[PDB]
Amino acid sequence: MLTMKDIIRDGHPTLRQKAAELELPLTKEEKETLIAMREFLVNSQDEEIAKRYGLRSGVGLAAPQINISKRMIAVLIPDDGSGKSYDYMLVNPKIVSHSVQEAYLPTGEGCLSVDDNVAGLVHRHNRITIKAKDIEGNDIQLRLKGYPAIVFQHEIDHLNGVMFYDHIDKNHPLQPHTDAVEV
């Protein structure tokens, strides 16, 4: 079971590296890692488990955050009432196309690797298309908008050594960009 002690914190050099492309097929160990990442998120969102193991609730996790500098991510976004929910373990995800129009969460973002909150909007693309492999090496192509697009951009940023706060405007941190979508 992964817990908070497995998550490296801001300042750890692994968070600023560029993660390596996975060879397919994955090793059994690489499969287990990705499954465990997802299982962390499942745990983090279960109120009784998260309290018992001291977990902060998360909807995404990238391998560099557990000190594994490989291009794998897990995203687990529960149904927000629309019937839309997202449960994906992706290998070698890439954004192949995106909107010009931006989107932001109105309170900013948080990260399990960053112990203290950082104020400011994180403008990302409102719409993205991702091509990736799944854990068995089969092909996935996702079309995402709004909150799930944001989450996946945040996770993919970790693979390139980028943190959310890198996107914050130090002069006008809370000023929305013109025509950006508030999510």
Nearer to Mg ion by C-beta: 115 or 136?
115
Residue 125, annotated as binding a ligand:
no
Catalytic residue from among 29, 47, 155, 182: 155
Check the chain for breaks (C–N over 2.5 Å) and list the residue before each, or none.
none
Question: Can residue 74 be called a binding residue for Mg ion (CB under 5 A)?
Answer: no
- Options 12-20, 42-50, 111-119, 125-133: segment touching Mg ion (CB under 5 A): 111-119
Q: Is 72 left (phi over 0), alpha (psi -120 to 50) or beta?
A: beta
Q: What are phi and psi of 159, to 5 degrees?
A: -70, -20
Radius of gyration of the chain (CA): 16
Tell me the CA distances in angstroms from 132 to 24, 45, 58, 172, one per residue in order. Answer: 12, 25, 21, 35
Q: Determine whether 136 is an active site residue.
A: no
Residue 111, annotated as binding a ligand:
yes
Question: Can residue 19 be called a binding residue for Mg ion (CB under 5 A)?
Answer: no
Question: Can residue 111 be called a binding residue for Mg ion (CB under 5 A)?
Answer: yes
Work out whether strand 86-98 and strand 124-125 pair parallel, antiparallel, or are unpaired.
unpaired
Amino acid at 111: C
Question: Can residue 22 be called a binding residue for Mg ion (CB under 5 A)?
Answer: no
Question: Can residue 7 be called a binding residue for Mg ion (CB under 5 A)?
Answer: no
Question: Can residue 168 be called a binding residue for Mg ion (CB under 5 A)?
Answer: no
Enumerate binding residues for Mg ion (CB under 5 A): 111
Binding residues: 111, 154, 158
Binding residues for Fe cation: 111, 154, 158
